[PDB]
């Protein structure tokens, strides 16, 4: 509440999961990969896409 | 003295190409920071001998 709006930079306050390092409720950690050598610029914008 | 592209292209890849023949490998993931450091994490089949 305080540190979301009131700063020029984003600041969190959080609790690590109970299950220390595995499987936080609803969701995923997706990995987007270059597998043919297109470009950091190109892949970066693909992440943007 | 290194930046990121110095780090991936001098060390990260020299290493990730020799990482042949590791038992029960699931995935490999590496940071190449502009602080000059590189960190490569290989996660293994749950419970293969550490």
């Amino acid at each position: 509440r305080a540190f979301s709006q009131i700063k020029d930079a984003m600041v969190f306050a959080f609790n690590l999961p109970a299950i220390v390092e595995l499987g936080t409720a609803t969701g995923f950690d997706f990995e987007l990969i270059d597998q043919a050598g297109l470009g950091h610029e190109k892949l970066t914008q693909a992440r943007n896409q | 003295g290194a930046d990121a592209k110095t780090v991936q292209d001098t060390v990260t890849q020299v290493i990730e190409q020799n990482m042949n023949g590791i038992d029960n490998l699931m995935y490999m993931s590496s940071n190449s920071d502009s602080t000059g450091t590189v960190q490569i994490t290989l996660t293994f089949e749950s419970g293969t001998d550490a």
Binding site: D34, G37 | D9, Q13, V14, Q17
Partner: protein
């Protein structure tokens, strides 16, 4: 470097690091007379045949 070739440095191909060698052309390290074909420069500054 001539007859064996030389591992000198690496380069970055299409985003994968690869080796860089330099050796004699085919036709200049085949038959014993090719020994005569090469020169090394001395301290006195001239080219010297083998």
């Amino acid at each position: 470097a001539a007859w064996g070739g030389s591992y000198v440095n690496d380069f970055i191909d299409r985003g994968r690091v690869k080796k860089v060698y330099v050796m004699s052309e085919a036709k200049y390290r085949m038959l014993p007379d090719d020994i005569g074909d090469w020169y090394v420069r001395a301290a006195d500054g001239q080219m010297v045949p083998f």
